[PDB]
Structures are given as C-alpha cells and as structure tokens.
Amino acid sequence: GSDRDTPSPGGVSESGSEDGLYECHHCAKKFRRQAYLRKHLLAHHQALQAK
Ligand SMILES: [Zn+2]
C-alpha cells in the first residue's frame, strides 16, 4: 500500500456471476464462496467415495 505506479482501479464485472455470486446452472442455489460452490459441484458427483 505504497506503490510507485497506480494500483489501477479495476471497475469491471463478470456477466455470469454479475454480483460475484456463483450461480450453478441447472440449479436455483448460488454460493458467494468458491469452497461452498465446489462442495455443491461434488454434490453433483453421484458416485460416493465410501459407498
Ligand atoms: Zn448444481
């Protein structure tokens, strides 16, 4: 927090996330945390490890 150059004001937005929430397509449930979305991505994985 003392950069010789301008840190550059990043004023963009990803369209699919919009707000920054990750909405899983084919589901209504969205997660703002990556870990929560990937746990849900594992909830798509029908094959249990300890079945
Ligand atoms: Zn899903």
Determination technique for this PDB entry? Answer: NMR
Cα–ligand 1 centroid distance for 28 (angstroms): 8
Q: How far is the centre of ligand 1, averaged over its atoms, from the C-alpha of 6 (Å)?
A: 40
CA angle, 44 then 45 then 49, to 5°: 145
Give distance in angstroms: CA of 13 to centre of ligand 1.
22
Instruction: Report the candidate in 12, 42, 24 with the shortest Cα–Cα distance to residue 32.
Output: 24
50: exposed, middle or buried (Cβ count in 10 Å: 0-12, 13-18, 19+): exposed
- Please name the residue ranges forming H helices in 1-51: 34-42
Ligand 1 mean position, distance from CA 42 (Å) = 9
Q: How far is the CA of 50 from the centre of ligand 1 (A)?
A: 21
